[PDB]
Amino acid sequence: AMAVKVAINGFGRIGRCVARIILERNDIELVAINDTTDIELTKYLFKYDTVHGEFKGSVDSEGDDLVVNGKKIKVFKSRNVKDLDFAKHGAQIVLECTGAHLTMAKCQEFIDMGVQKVIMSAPAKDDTPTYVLGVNSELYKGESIISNASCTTNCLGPVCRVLQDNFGIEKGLMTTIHAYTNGQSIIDAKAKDKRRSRAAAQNIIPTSTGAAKAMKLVMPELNGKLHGQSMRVPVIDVSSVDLTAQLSRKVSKDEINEAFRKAAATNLKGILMVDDDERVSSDFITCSYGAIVASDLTQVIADDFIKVIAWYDNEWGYSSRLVDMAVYIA
Amino acid sequence: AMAVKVAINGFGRIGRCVARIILERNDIELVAINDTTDIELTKYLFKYDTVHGEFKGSVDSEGDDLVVNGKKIKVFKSRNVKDLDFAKHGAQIVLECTGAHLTMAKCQEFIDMGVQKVIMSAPAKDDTPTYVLGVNSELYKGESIISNASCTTNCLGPVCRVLQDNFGIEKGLMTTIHAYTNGQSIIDAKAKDKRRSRAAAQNIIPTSTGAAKAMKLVMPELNGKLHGQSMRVPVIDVSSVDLTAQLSRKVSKDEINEAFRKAAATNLKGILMVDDDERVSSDFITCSYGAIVASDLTQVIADDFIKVIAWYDNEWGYSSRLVDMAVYIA
Amino acid sequence: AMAVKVAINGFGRIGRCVARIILERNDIELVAINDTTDIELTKYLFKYDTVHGEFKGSVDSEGDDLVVNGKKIKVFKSRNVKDLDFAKHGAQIVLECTGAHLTMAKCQEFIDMGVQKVIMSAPAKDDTPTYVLGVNSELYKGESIISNASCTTNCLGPVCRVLQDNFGIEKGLMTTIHAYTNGQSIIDAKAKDKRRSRAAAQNIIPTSTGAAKAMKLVMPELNGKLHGQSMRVPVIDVSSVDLTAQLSRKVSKDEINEAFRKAAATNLKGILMVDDDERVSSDFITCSYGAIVASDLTQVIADDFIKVIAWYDNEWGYSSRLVDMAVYIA
Amino acid sequence: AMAVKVAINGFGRIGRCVARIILERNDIELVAINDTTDIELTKYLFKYDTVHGEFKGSVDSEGDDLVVNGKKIKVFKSRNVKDLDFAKHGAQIVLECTGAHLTMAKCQEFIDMGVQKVIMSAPAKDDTPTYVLGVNSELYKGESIISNASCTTNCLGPVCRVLQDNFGIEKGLMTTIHAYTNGQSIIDAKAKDKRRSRAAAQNIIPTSTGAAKAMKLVMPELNGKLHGQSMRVPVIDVSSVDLTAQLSRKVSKDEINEAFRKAAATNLKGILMVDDDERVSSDFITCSYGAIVASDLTQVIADDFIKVIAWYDNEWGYSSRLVDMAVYIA
Numbered sequence A, B, C, D: 001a002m003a004v005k006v007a008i009n010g011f012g013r014i015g016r017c018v019a020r021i022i023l024e025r026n027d028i029e030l031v032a033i034n035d036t037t038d039i040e041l042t043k044y045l046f047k048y049d050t051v052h053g054e055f056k057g058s059v060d061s062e063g064d065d066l067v068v069n070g071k072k073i074k075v076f077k078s079r080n081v082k083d084l085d086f087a088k089h090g091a092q093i094v095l096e097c098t099g100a101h102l103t104m105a106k107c108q109e110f111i112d113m114g115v116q117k118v119i120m121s122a123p124a125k126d127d128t129p130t131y132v133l134g135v136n137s138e139l140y141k142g143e144s145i146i147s148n149a150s151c152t153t154n155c156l157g158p159v160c161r162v163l164q165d166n167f168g169i170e171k172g173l174m175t176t177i178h179a180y181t182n183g184q185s186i187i188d189a190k191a192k193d194k195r196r197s198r199a200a201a202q203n204i205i206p207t208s209t210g211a212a213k214a215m216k217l218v219m220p221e222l223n224g225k226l227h228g229q230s231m232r233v234p235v236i237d238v239s240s241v242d243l244t245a246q247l248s249r250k251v252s253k254d255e256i257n258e259a260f261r262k263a264a265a266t267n268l269k270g271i272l273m274v275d276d277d278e279r280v281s282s283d284f285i286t287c288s289y290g291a292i293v294a295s296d297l298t299q300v301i302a303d304d305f306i307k308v309i310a311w312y313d314n315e316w317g318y319s320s321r322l323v324d325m326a327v328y329i330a
């Protein structure tokens, strides 16, 4: 296969993580980006990163192109999909990382201008088909617009895949302890709701997520069986899924941990891993696994009532899945 | 009743919170403290607090006495209970806030020197009787040495009391998102185990707690039915209990929230309250309630599988219970 | 005097601090506010504050009015000064706390609609007269539009007043270690320049300030003699001025500290104080002094080369000066 | 030259940074360490680092040896220099990183047991000769016990070298904005003085440093001409020197920046660099330069009164100098 050619719409945390990941691999090539910023600021943000460290390599411009380690990348700056002829620079797949385009209606214009496939970097706001690697990726039907779901779906999903396949999930509730993100306020200031208005680096902030209820999209046998919620805490990156569930049969802790290690070695290779070293959140910064189960934190009480704790780099793991998904569907 | 006279052994976060709470009430009087610090540093730490703000009032010394708003308080500085004649300064109850004395054997010397009652500010390391206000305080038998359990027991306990009395708990697992505390490291440095060695203000740190399994001490019907664990996050104070449980019957969200509001108004007055305002952690700094249930975060799936989220000021709520317990047993 | 009636345009950190300060005093009355938020969010942000704690008292609405402890306050929600008939609700002075209106041209519409006086909550972007209490407030000429300068001017200004009056300033450079503020990013994301794009709670961020060069506006004898700069650090509130200067004559540390204590007791009463207790930043949260000189940090080398360190609550001290200035010019 | 063989006494932040730096170079070899920890915790802390990331490579034990990428390193665990036969494992130089041994008297026992040279990882508490690379390293006389001074000396020193050589320093005062370190408290708790007792991740904390006054040890022409102080802020690593000085003649900003760039390219190659990219603190995590002058922050007022801002990774820059110094004196 020729390396699939892709464009990135939206050069934020996910956009720039995706770009770095594409530049480390030989089976995918970045030809264009779009962000509503001047080129001096694009270069600076790409080169220097508080979380993932300095990009090793030259980051130059000339004058509508990023030049990264000598390779030219076209840079657009328009809010309007009309002005983004990504296909004209060779793009086969657009990675949609703006947060602005989460319906087929708003992504169809890319296809109409000659892009073959669009992948949303977030849950769809309509009935756009949703795919998650290792969970329902085997069912892909060649659709030209898909959702890759959320960072949380790409941790919780693989965990559920293993539990459902080995044991059976009767019901479950999930909390995520989640790193703060953009569109949380630095100081108490107006936002879309009360709790999101409060200072993110000095509070525990309850925040809603549809990630659990929406598992029906990628595992329909879990329709009506899972819900959950989030607690935003003062870390800049890395999060955990805390899944509490009732399984269809009696299990032990060891049996659960062994099922995860067996998937880590086979069907979820590269996607789920198991931590036997007692790491903390910062150890998973720039980790490409979507789920890291902390084996020592696995609990079972009264035969069938379990807790599983899985880390995810909400930036780097999800970005790693977006890039895997572009390579998979090409 | 004459105001019960008490001494505080250990003038740390709990010791100093307890002292401030005693100085705001007329039914308890502080006569002595002990801490292995010089008197200049005792005054400074008591007067200024990063979390709970400046003490309003005069904080002076003369020269073995704190003088707080004109009232003289004896200050000892010895690690050894032998040198602490608290009873000689009128103390009826010792609040044991050192972390050093969590067995009847190590507290008996206080009784032997004329103290009437000792209350441990932590779970006992032996079979010392444990009491929690609103949970099993009605069963107190006049024992002269007791444990008031942990900050977590004084949030989770009252929550369980309500769930058990209205609905029946079949089984449950708990996560606490907990503020960092003393004897967590500022930077990666050796501690009693791996995870406790890691920088507390820049990581999510899984940490063990016996608080759930130990609920059998205060609610024996929950023997073998609860376990749980902790995630230390970068907040200086205030924590949450996240309880996931299977109840003995079908319930709704509204029914659970109404049971909490009914206890808040009756048997758990002053102990449990319900938040209907969508507060965040910093809103509960210096809150005297041991449990604040966030009503909007209450979840039920598949009839009987529930999640309840309750805040607690791990410093001020527990300290408020220690002071209530001293007044109650006097 | 009747209590001067004021309106607040812009209900952010400064707007809400100003409002709380007005509600604690009997010589000024708040009749109206404006902020582009729904009334539910206005109430929540006013009631709960991560930094300054819960407002003690009832915060209700009915339905275009905040009702605070029973007193009705009109709430507008328009970006356009055209729609803000503050004078119709009795306002004599508008406190301009939006950041949007820092020229006489943009504030004249308030006067044209019957407001007597406007005070900008920031340095003017034109030649609008600037006044700072204790510095050049004695020179006020009855102007109907003024600037109260910046939080930094209201710390550095009073410090310079004392140094200039006792000793003579030949030249000086200033660094401020400054709390993060709104319009700093939570995560690395595009902003008006490179450094402002970087995560505020995980970096030391050099940031420009005109506060030193602009001292000529309030002390013309310092024209061309001072410049300085800022380092934003991860604290939510409270900052320091670090002034390094060459004085016109030889001085000692004691002589400098005594000059500050003498101004604290006389001409800068309520404005500058001296800390002899070795406090840290969080001790000055909700402090109404514009400058708190840390006496133990005062340095002199080689006769005439000095350093002075002064704290300021960048929110509460400046807000306290805005309210003092409204009362002073009424 | 054979690669000089060294041992590390004290495996904390400096000890472990030094070890990682030694394992990346071919001109120095690590044969032994000492730390009062069990071997499981030594491995974990070496392998995982909140600040500098995961060690790339195998970290094993057998059973009194770290095995790092296949190479055996002896591990002692004794507080007493008596039990540390580093020379028996081939060590020529001991890097003294405990903080416990800062006099010739306390380091002489190493020489007496066959070590050729000891380097203190901190300023000496006696008249032990002090050397700093690029500053007075050319004057080394073969002394077998030296101090490498402090992290701050290894930033401020090189900056002064350039200013003194090009312009002449008449006098100067310095502030450092410094990352928190071990032996600062996580929560308000007793420490050696008042300010060090206060919570390090939620305050700006004034802290004393002898680094400026002590410049006379490495540049005697600066005897009595410099003093300074520190402000600890909530960052886990990386600090800045803010030097304010009066030079012997008139200079411009450009002239100062050009003098630094010229030293960066010649006599201070590898030691001082100049930032022309507007980086923030986290960009210098794991930076080996002892001084990074931020060229855009250089200020001059009234001919001869200057400010210079220089970053340093207080861990990695100093550690890089310790390793350079061991190679230089071998």
Ligand SMILES: NC(=O)c1ccc[n+]([C@@H]2O[C@H](COP(=O)([O-])OP(=O)(O)OC[C@H]3O[C@@H](n4cnc5c(N)ncnc54)[C@H](OP(=O)(O)O)[C@@H]3O)[C@@H](O)[C@H]2O)c1
Pocket: A009, A010, A011, A012, A013, A014, A015, A034, A035, A036, A078, A079, A080, A097, A098, A099, A100, A121, A122, A150, A151, A181, A182, A314, A315, A318, C189, C190
């Ligand atoms: N943990 C995570 O961060 C994470 C993980 C997985 C999924 N996601 C999802 O990924 C998406 C991006 O999140 P993020 O964290 O990368 O946010 P971000 O850092 O704010 O990135 C979004 C970027 O898109 C730009 N943008 C917005 N609308 C645009 C438009 N119409 N045309 C062009 N550029 C536009 C933004 O500029 P402006 O700021 O000026 O609007 C910004 O640079 C969202 O859908 C988010 O939910 C986030």
Ligand SMILES: NC(=O)c1ccc[n+]([C@@H]2O[C@H](COP(=O)([O-])OP(=O)(O)OC[C@H]3O[C@@H](n4cnc5c(N)ncnc54)[C@H](OP(=O)(O)O)[C@@H]3O)[C@@H](O)[C@H]2O)c1
Pocket: B009, B010, B011, B012, B013, B014, B015, B034, B035, B036, B078, B079, B080, B097, B098, B099, B100, B121, B122, B150, B151, B181, B182, B314, B315, B318, D189, D190
């Ligand atoms: N969230 C909370 O903080 C919280 C809540 C509920 C329960 N607790 C429990 O309350 C107790 C105290 O916790 P804390 O957070 O207040 O800790 P802390 O701030 O470290 O306070 C403990 C204090 O006791 C002193 N001390 C220790 N051993 C002593 C002895 N033998 N004699 C005299 N003084 C002694 C310590 O001095 P040294 O530092 O020199 O040893 C320190 O000042 C522990 O049992 C803890 O588990 C904590």
Ligand SMILES: NC(=O)c1ccc[n+]([C@@H]2O[C@H](COP(=O)([O-])OP(=O)(O)OC[C@H]3O[C@@H](n4cnc5c(N)ncnc54)[C@H](OP(=O)(O)O)[C@@H]3O)[C@@H](O)[C@H]2O)c1
Pocket: A189, A190, C009, C010, C011, C012, C013, C014, C015, C034, C035, C036, C078, C079, C080, C097, C098, C099, C100, C121, C122, C150, C151, C181, C182, C314, C315, C318
């Ligand atoms: N340390 C400090 O915070 C400090 C100290 C002294 C001086 N100041 C100055 O005080 C002013 C406010 O600062 P702040 O920290 O309070 O910022 P803030 O919290 O962002 O407050 C500004 C508020 O004004 C609103 N607003 C903006 N433009 C408006 C308009 N045209 N009409 C109505 N409302 C409008 C904003 O809504 P939107 O967010 O939607 O625009 C926001 O609620 C600035 O001039 C600032 O430089 C700040």
Ligand SMILES: NC(=O)c1ccc[n+]([C@@H]2O[C@H](COP(=O)([O-])OP(=O)(O)OC[C@H]3O[C@@H](n4cnc5c(N)ncnc54)[C@H](OP(=O)(O)O)[C@@H]3O)[C@@H](O)[C@H]2O)c1
Pocket: B189, B190, D009, D010, D011, D012, D013, D014, D015, D034, D035, D036, D078, D079, D080, D097, D098, D099, D100, D121, D122, D150, D151, D181, D182, D314, D315, D318
């Ligand atoms: N920014 C920086 O961190 C920095 C920069 C330059 C210079 N330094 C200097 O470098 C030295 C170490 O600082 P650090 O930050 O690495 O501190 P650290 O992380 O606390 O490391 C010190 C280590 O030495 C151990 N230790 C102490 N006394 C010992 C003894 N007698 N024998 C054996 N091991 C002993 C400690 O164990 P215990 O904790 O049990 O005592 C700890 O592991 C100090 O002199 C410091 O001032 C620090």
Ligand code: NA
Pocket: A022, A023, A024, A025, A026, A027, A028, A029, A030
């Ligand atoms: Na590539």
Ligand code: NA
Pocket: A183, A184, A185, A186, A195, A196, A197, A198, A199, A200, A205
């Ligand atoms: Na927020």
Ligand code: NA
Pocket: B022, B023, B024, B025, B026, B027, B028, B029, B030
């Ligand atoms: Na009392």
Ligand code: NA
Pocket: B183, B184, B185, B186, B195, B196, B197, B198, B199, B200, B205
């Ligand atoms: Na820790």
Ligand code: NA
Pocket: C022, C023, C024, C025, C026, C027, C028, C029, C030
């Ligand atoms: Na009033």
Ligand code: NA
Pocket: C183, C184, C185, C186, C195, C196, C197, C198, C199, C200, C205
């Ligand atoms: Na910023």
Ligand code: NA
Pocket: D022, D023, D024, D025, D026, D027, D028, D029, D030
């Ligand atoms: Na080596």
Ligand code: NA
Pocket: D183, D184, D185, D186, D195, D196, D197, D198, D199, D200, D205
């Ligand atoms: Na400290």
